[PDB]
């Protein structure tokens, strides 16, 4: 039969679409090339930051405050005689005051998709200037050395505060009067208990948006620390491609894979779909429990302090 006439009618219209879509991409692309080239030129000159180290010092932040540390700027601590004092950022305001910030996000200023060592050593900017003022009172995203973090906790009872907020302002947080990460020799485990506060016990009770085997497989508590440079997830598979850390770019105490992904991919706006994730998963700092698997926070922080 005579069905041929549809060729001159159908094919063309598609040709028009492909032309639009394809041509739109070529320019869209040349657009990015200009940016990458340009941004590249900028990193030929790093940022300068000057932080006058306060005289007051101690082991953690708790000691400092009880030592005349009222202002909330970066300090210099030393939790042990056999370790070099390092910089850090002490929050002396939030709830009682005297919390030792261990990790923080707020603008994606520093990528957290680093290898294992960086996470062991520590990376990011402890703190930046305060609009002219010689000292550094502003934060800036980072992750102090694991070994330190472990060493910190493994020397007295400790607790944690994981505040955060969306792009609506609304804030929430978690509280564990019992935090402890093991030494590098033990893949930096993480034994957290004693939940509190409102935001979601997505660190020991798994995710709320799941049930049974699905949920109980998202409990960070007692897991090991993994990086796309070294796999220690609860995801047992042979495909090198399939690993929590590679999926959701970044080091964390993954477990097939997370109920909360701090240290993820700081996205903008706050929302995002699967067809944007680097791998197609749901990377990026998201608590999920308070918001959902598709929503990276505007600010994510963690801080420690003794139990007493």
């Amino acid at each position: 039969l005579y069905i041929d006439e549809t060729v001159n009618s159908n094919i063309p219209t598609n040709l028009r679409v492909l032309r639009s879509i394809l041509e739109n991409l070529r320019s869209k692309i040349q657009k990015l090339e200009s940016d990458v080239s340009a941004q590249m030129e900028y990193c030929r000159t790093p940022c300068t930051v000057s932080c006058n180290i306060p005289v007051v010092s101690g082991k953690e932040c708790e000691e400092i405050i009880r030592k005349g540390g009222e202002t909330s700027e970066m300090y210099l601590i030393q939790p042990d005689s056999s370790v070099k004092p390092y910089r850090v950022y002490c929050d002396m305001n939030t709830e009682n005051g005297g919390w030792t910030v261990i990790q923080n996000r707020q603008d994606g200023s520093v990528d957290f998709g680093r290898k294992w060592d960086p996470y062991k050593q520590g990376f990011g900017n402890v703190a930046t200037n305060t609009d002219g003022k010689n000292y550094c009172g502003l934060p800036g995203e980072y992750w102090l050395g694991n070994d330190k973090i472990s060493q910190l906790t493994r020397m007295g009872p400790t607790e944690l505060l994981i505040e955060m907020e969306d792009w609506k302002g609304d804030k929430v947080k978690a509280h564990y009067g019992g935090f402890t990460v093991q030494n590098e020799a033990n893949k930096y485990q993480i034994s957290v208990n004693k939940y509190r506060g409102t935001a979601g016990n997505a660190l020991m009770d798994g995710a709320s948006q799941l049930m049974g085997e699905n949920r109980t497989m998202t409990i960070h508590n007692g897991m090991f620390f993994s990086t796309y440079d070294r796999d220690n997830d609860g995801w047992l598979t042979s495909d090198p491609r399939k690993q929590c850390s590679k999926e959701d770019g970044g080091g964390w105490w993954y477990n097939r894979c997370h109920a909360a992904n701090p240290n993820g991919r700081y996205y903008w706006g706050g929302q995002y779909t699967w067809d944007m994730a680097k791998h197609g998963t749901d990377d990026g700092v998201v608590w999920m429990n308070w918001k959902g698997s598709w929503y990276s926070m505007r600010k994510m922080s963690m801080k420690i302090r003794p139990f007493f």
């Binding site: 799941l210 085997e213 699905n214 497989m217 995801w235 999926e247 097939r256 997370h258 749901d282 990377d283």
Partner: peptide, 5 residues
């Protein structure tokens, strides 16, 4: 984002 069986 979990990984089913």
């Amino acid at each position: 984002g979990h990984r089913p069986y």
